[PDB]
């Protein structure tokens with residue numbers, strides 16, 4: 001799906017996780033976030049359209065997705081161990097990654 | 107690209123990294139492998155075609171791509187700090203990951 | 213060094229990274245933080261002093277050091293590839309980790 | 319404890335994991351390996367005694383422990399999810415890391 005579509009999926013699921021009561025709700029939302037982040041990997045954002053695809057900007061753009069994907073991987077291990085409150089707080093650590101990439105490229 | 111397409115990209119670029127004589131050749135191959143791994147995220151392999159998407163078999167299948175994506179992340183940091191022998195030796199690491207997923211799911 | 217000693221090292225070096233003007237100053241501070249985090253691995257904090265060592269509370273306590281050590285690993289790769297603004301911004305990432313463990317266990 | 323003492327702990331526990339039948343045996347051994355790797359962080363190996371502590375050799379020596387500690391972190395998540403055979407195979411991925419550091423520094 002397109003970069004904005006993936007960002008809506010990330011946004012909607014981060015809010016689901018915040019409001020969640022149980023591990024099943026949290027696991028399902030993190031699974032959707034993992035798929036959206038992986039799908040966004042290859043996107044070129046509008047502000048980097050005129051850069052070479054090998055520019056340090058596009059390199060640093062993709063580095064943000066490595067950080068986000070790694071954080072979702074850990075949050076899912078914590079949810080699958082039944083540590084719901086820990087998985088929810090780990091989902092809050094995602095916000096810094098969201099903000100760092102937005103600050104530079106949104 | 108379909109799973110088989112992404113796999114040929116991973117296979118071709120893993121070979122380039124083993125044969126490479128300079129950092130630019132390793133970096134280019136690692137970047138292509140990262141794109142192929144992220145794009146493979148969404149695929150259902152033939153052995154799991156009749157498993158539900160949000161099943162445990164599909165969760166366990168996708169976990170191998172988190173491992174691979176993390177190994178490519180590290181290899182690219184080694185290549186970009188000029189440690190090209192070290193970056194190439196990351197290939198021995200990636201191959202174990204390739205082999206574990208194939209043993210279970212191919 | 214005891215836990216309190218390691219914590220002062222983490223606190224002092226996190227400040228150096230925020231104030232740093234060059235890569236060498238950030239790298240030196242990150243290396244000191246990595247040594248302090250690894251050395252804190254073995255500590256039993258006051259709130260868990262009466263929990264068994266191989267208990268779940270102590271496992272959950274030590275998991276925060278895996279997160280911190282992983283964040284310092286990435287920040288040092290960013291500093292060593294010359295991305296010093298990016299390396300300093302890793303401080304916002306580390307501080308979340310500091311705060312999550314303190315909220316639960318301090 | 320000293321570097322050789324930590325290496326005996328890593329060796330003995332890697333063999334325990336290989337021979338293990340259940341998740342409790344695997345979890346206990348990985349926990350011991352996590353403590354030994356963290357304790358070995360700050361060691362200077364005999365072959366790098368005459369190098370500066372900031373040499374790229376000592377930097378690359380410590381990088382191996384980041385890789386090992388990360389791999390033990392994942393293996394423990396897999397054991398705590400009850401995926402015993404996956405945790406055992408993840409423990410086998412440690413061998414490449416063992417060999418890469420030994421090849422250079424043992």
Ligand code: HEC
Pocket residue numbers: 003004005007008010011014045046061062063064065068094095097098099101102105106
């Ligand atoms: C870069 C590596 C990013 C990360 C990590 C995240 N986002 Fe993002 N986001 C990014 C860009 C380049 C853009 C702009 C896209 C455009 O075409 O203009 C965005 C945009 C969003 C939006 C707005 C979507 C819209 O208006 O249609 C949202 C709501 C959003 N991003 C949310 C979001 C969240 C919740 C993230 C982490 C969990 C996150 N993004 C990460 C680049 C990057």
Ligand code: HEC
Pocket residue numbers: 109110113114116117120151152167168169170171174200201203204205207208211212
């Ligand atoms: C799961 C997480 C996998 C990882 C990691 C890697 N591979 Fe893979 N690969 C996987 C599957 C399920 C399949 C079969 C796909 C199908 O529809 O047939 C494959 C296939 C290959 C092939 C094709 C040859 C074959 O015998 O089918 C190749 C050449 C291949 N994969 C290479 C490869 C490499 C080099 C990897 C790591 C660097 C790698 N794969 C990882 C599942 C997974």
Ligand code: HEC
Pocket residue numbers: 215216219220222223226257258273274275276277280306307309310311313314317318
């Ligand atoms: C658990 C995994 C922790 C992480 C990660 C960090 N800290 Fe910590 N810190 C922790 C404990 C249990 C304690 C109390 C120790 C005691 O015996 O009293 C502390 C203490 C501190 C202190 C001392 C001040 C206080 O109010 O007790 C400081 C200044 C401190 N920690 C700083 C710090 C920083 C900067 C961290 C991340 C970069 C950090 N800590 C992580 C447990 C854990």
Ligand code: HEC
Pocket residue numbers: 321322323325326328329332363364379380381382383386412413415416417419420423424
């Ligand atoms: C560097 C980053 C290393 C990693 C990762 C591992 N080992 Fe190691 N090991 C390392 C050095 C520098 C040495 C030599 C120490 C010396 O003082 O000469 C070793 C040694 C060992 C030994 C021999 C111990 C002895 O003879 O007393 C063993 C059995 C050993 N190492 C096992 C081992 C295993 C099982 C590892 C991964 C699971 C591993 N080591 C990682 C440096 C590094």
Ligand SMILES: [Cl-]
Pocket residue numbers: 064067096097098100101
């Ligand atoms: Cl980030």
Ligand SMILES: [Cl-]
Pocket residue numbers: 170173202203206207
């Ligand atoms: Cl794997």
Ligand SMILES: [Cl-]
Pocket residue numbers: 276279308309312313
């Ligand atoms: Cl944390």
Ligand SMILES: [Cl-]
Pocket residue numbers: 382385414415416418419
């Ligand atoms: Cl290694």
Ligand SMILES: [Mg+2]
Pocket residue numbers: 004
């Ligand atoms: Mg738009």
Ligand SMILES: [Mg+2]
Pocket residue numbers: 107108145
């Ligand atoms: Mg495709």
Ligand SMILES: [Mg+2]
Pocket residue numbers: 213214251
């Ligand atoms: Mg100490």
Ligand SMILES: [Mg+2]
Pocket residue numbers: 322
């Ligand atoms: Mg000796």
Ligand SMILES: [Zn+2]
Pocket residue numbers: 074077275278391395
């Ligand atoms: Zn974890």
Ligand SMILES: [Zn+2]
Pocket residue numbers: 076077080165169399
């Ligand atoms: Zn899992």
Ligand SMILES: [Zn+2]
Pocket residue numbers: 089090093279308309312
């Ligand atoms: Zn946390």
Ligand SMILES: [Zn+2]
Pocket residue numbers: 067096097100301302305
């Ligand atoms: Zn960041």
